[PDB]
Amino acid sequence: RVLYRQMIVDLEIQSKDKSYAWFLTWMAKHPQRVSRHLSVRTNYIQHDNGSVSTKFSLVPGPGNHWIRYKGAFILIKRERSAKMIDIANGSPFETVTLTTLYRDKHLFDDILNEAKDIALKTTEGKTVIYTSFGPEWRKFGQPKAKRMLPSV
Amino acid sequence: RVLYRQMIVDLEIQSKDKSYAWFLTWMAKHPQRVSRHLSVRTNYIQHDNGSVSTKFSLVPGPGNHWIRYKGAFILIKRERSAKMIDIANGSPFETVTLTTLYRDKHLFDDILNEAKDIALKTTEGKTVIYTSFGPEWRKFGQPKAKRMLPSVILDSGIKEGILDDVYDFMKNGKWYSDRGIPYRRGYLLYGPPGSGKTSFIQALAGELDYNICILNLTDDRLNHLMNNMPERSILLLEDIDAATFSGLLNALDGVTSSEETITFMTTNHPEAIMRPGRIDYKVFVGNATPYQVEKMFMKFYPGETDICKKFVNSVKELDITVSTAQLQGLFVMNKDAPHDALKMVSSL
Amino acid sequence: ILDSGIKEGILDDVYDFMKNGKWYSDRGIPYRRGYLLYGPPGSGKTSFIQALAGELDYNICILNLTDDRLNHLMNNMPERSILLLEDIDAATFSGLLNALDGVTSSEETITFMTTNHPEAIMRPGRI
Numbered sequence: 001r002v003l004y005r006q007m008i009v010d011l012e013i014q015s016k017d018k019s020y021a022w023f024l025t026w027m028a029k030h031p032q033r034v035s036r037h038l039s040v041r042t043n044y045i046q047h048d049n050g051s052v053s054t055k056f057s058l059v060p061g062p063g064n065h066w067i068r069y070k071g072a073f074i075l076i077k078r079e080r081s082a083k084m085i086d087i088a089n090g091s092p093f094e095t096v097t098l099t100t101l102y103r104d105k106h107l108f109d110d111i112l113n114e115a116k117d118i119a120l121k122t123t124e125g126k127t128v129i130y131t132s133f134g135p136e137w138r139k140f141g142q143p144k145a146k147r148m149l150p151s152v
Numbered sequence: 153r154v155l156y157r158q159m160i161v162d163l164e165i166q167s168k169d170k171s172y173a174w175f176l177t178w179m180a181k182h183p184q185r186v187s188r189h190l191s192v193r194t195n196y197i198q199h200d201n202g203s204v205s206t207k208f209s210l211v212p213g214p215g216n217h218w219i220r221y222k223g224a225f226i227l228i229k230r231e232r233s234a235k236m237i238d239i240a241n242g243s244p245f246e247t248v249t250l251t252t253l254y255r256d257k258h259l260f261d262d263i264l265n266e267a268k269d270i271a272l273k274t275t276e277g278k279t280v281i282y283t284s285f286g287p288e289w290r291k292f293g294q295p296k297a298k299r300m301l302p303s304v305i306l307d308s309g310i311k312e313g314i315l316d317d318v319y320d321f322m323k324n325g326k327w328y329s330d331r332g333i334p335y336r337r338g339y340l341l342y343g344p345p346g347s348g349k350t351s352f353i354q355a356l357a358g359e360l361d362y363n364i365c366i367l368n369l370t371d372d373r374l375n376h377l378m379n380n381m382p383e384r385s386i387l388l389l390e391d392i393d394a395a396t397f398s399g400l401l402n403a404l405d406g407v408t409s410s411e412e413t414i415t416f417m418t419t420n421h422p423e424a425i426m427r428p429g430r431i432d433y434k435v436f437v438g439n440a441t442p443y444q445v446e447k448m449f450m451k452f453y454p455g456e457t458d459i460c461k462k463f464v465n466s467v468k469e470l471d472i473t474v475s476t477a478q479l480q481g482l483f484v485m486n487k488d489a490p491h492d493a494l495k496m497v498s499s500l
Numbered sequence: 501i502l503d504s505g506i507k508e509g510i511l512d513d514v515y516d517f518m519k520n521g522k523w524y525s526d527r528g529i530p531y532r533r534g535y536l537l538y539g540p541p542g543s544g545k546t547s548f549i550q551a552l553a554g555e556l557d558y559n560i561c562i563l564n565l566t567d568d569r570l571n572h573l574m575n576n577m578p579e580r581s582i583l584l585l586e587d588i589d590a591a592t593f594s595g596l597l598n599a600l601d602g603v604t605s606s607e608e609t610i611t612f613m614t615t616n617h618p619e620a621i622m623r624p625g626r627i
């Protein structure tokens with residue numbers, strides 16, 4: 001056991017961190033892996049009307065999987081706690097554990113960077129335009145969209 | 153144990169997800185299964201009165217069942233936690249686990265899609281109509297119902313010439329963004345009064361489940377009204393031929409949002425605005441056609457083809473301003489009786 | 501207690517009108533219906549309407565006979581209600597017909613009407 005823990009690294013991403021959903025989203029879209037388990041995640045928006053916009057997507061889910069990032073054979077576990085309950089999302093406390101050799105520790109940042117990009121590609125800002133209303137600045141013209149510099 | 157976990161998949165739907173009730177509802181209505189266990193689910197609404205509307209329905213419930221979807225023999229367990237308590241619904245934490253072979257993993261999405269449809273069939277939207285109250289939009293006329301596009305009957309090609317132009321305009325976000333032009337579009341339904349324009353706009357908004365922020369024709373607040381529109385809306389401008397004109401064009405060019413901004417315009421007689429970016433799709437919905445009269449007659453009375461022709465050649469004579477509102481009026485007063493309509497509508 | 505056939509001629513017309521949602525939706529006509537109980541004063545009309553509302557456990561939004569707010573009153577009715585118009589023979593008439601044609605809701609909209617002497621409104625969609 002000590003020799004095995006002496007040639008590997010770990011990386012725990014716990015369910016509180018913002019980099020938990022990002023990483024599962026990334027690992028869903030990875031081409032080469034073997035993930036026997038799956039978990040549904042369904043977003044579901046009810047507007048002012050009874051109208052519903054809903055969408056479901058599968059993710060790795062509890063139990064361990066494997067992945068091959070750049071010739072690494074990373075082993076990932078995902079675990080749920082049988083006793084503790086988070087109050088931020090109303091779900092039990094979860095934990096993802098990545099594990100590769102020590103030699104490829106430098107891969108982890110790369111992975112997380114990729115995840116951040118796949119996270120940042122979807123979330124898009126909107127350039128709010130404030131304006132003068134007497135001696136105080138008020139918002140005006142509910143958020144515009146980015147004008148995408150090649151366009152000008 | 154490792155070989156067995158080596159030829160199967162799992163799918164955990166946990167009790168927090170919205171796709172938990174949907175799936176149990178779906179599996180209740182599946183024809184071929186063997187579910188020894190059952191659980192009651194009782195909805196119970198007490199109104200302002202002591203009156204009660206209550207309804208109970210059985211679902212799979214705890215313990216494992218079986219099902220056969222498309223020749224798969226899926227095994228499903230449902231479990232409750234003896235220690236944890238959810239605070240959203242006040243119940244212990246539950247979990248559904250589907251398990252089939254790896255080869256039929258692609259079935260899961262299908263199942264969930266079916267569940268979503270059985271979920272989406274019951275929940276029905278209602279096209280709220282906002283309106284102008286000074287320089288601010290207030291709700292008006294507590295939610296209507298969807299008008300169900302087959303119900304409105306207009307000319308042969310106009311029902312598809314707009315339902316596909318709009319469906320294209322909902323897919324050209326990148327095209328409008330990369331060119332550096334605003335992402336908006338106008339429409340000009342024109343014709344005689346009482347031809348079914350507003351009815352068609354409401355039917356289309358019900359198709360796209362948006363909300364009609366109706367506005368009929370002050371110039372300083374018109375710009376404020378254009379700029380401040382709620383989420384998921386479809387602007388409607390009745391009678392644009394009643395007008396400040398330069399301010400109208402200025403505010404009409406200065407309409408923006410964070411998403412699509414469709415702005416239909418209806419007028420009774422359309423005689424600079426027709427430039428693209430402003431009004432760019434003009435189509436003429438007018439009086440009744442021998443196709444419209446046939447389709448209305450078949451809309452009211454399903455089947456009974458023989459009478460249909462016998463009406464059309466009758467309405468070919470004595471017709472001046474025959475409009476579809478008039479046909480709706482003269483067909484609703486003689487409901488469930490086409491033979492009375494044959495002699496009643498022909499004389500008006 | 502009223503005449504021999506009238507207790508069933510209305511308790512089955514209403515029970516049909518509660519089952520024709522698809523029929524009224526597919527035709528593209530609004531899903532409403534009026535009624536005209538007429539007779540001499542003191543015959544038991546209002547009592548029958550209250551008994552029927554108790555049968556369907558709805559709520560009687562009674563209104564007895566201003567034209568600009570009448571439309572607002574017609575439009576804004578609570579959930580699970582049954583409109584009642586006492587003495588429609590006391591009237592603005594064009595505004596009455598306009599607001600009466602412009603009554604809407606998210607569900608059924610029954611509107612009984614009682615009058616002591618009923619002498620255009622009788623067209624279907626209206627009474």
Ligand SMILES: Nc1ncnc2c1ncn2[C@@H]1O[C@H](COP(=O)(O)OP(=O)(O)O)[C@@H](O)[C@H]1O
Binds near residue numbers: 303304351
């Ligand atoms: N093609 C149609 N199908 C169904 N109802 C129609 C049709 N054309 C007109 N109507 C009816 O005519 C009435 C008034 O027409 P409306 O659409 O309000 O007129 P406009 O749009 O010209 O102002 C409504 O009750 C509407 O349902």
Ligand SMILES: Nc1ncnc2c1ncn2[C@@H]1O[C@H](COP(=O)(O)OP(=O)(O)O)[C@@H](O)[C@H]1O
Binds near residue numbers: 502543544614
């Ligand atoms: N068949 C009946 N059953 C019960 N009460 C009745 C009946 N007929 C008349 N009444 C009595 O008539 C009275 C007045 O009825 P009301 O509804 O005010 O009459 P109207 O609708 O003609 O104005 C009530 O006190 C009611 O109990």
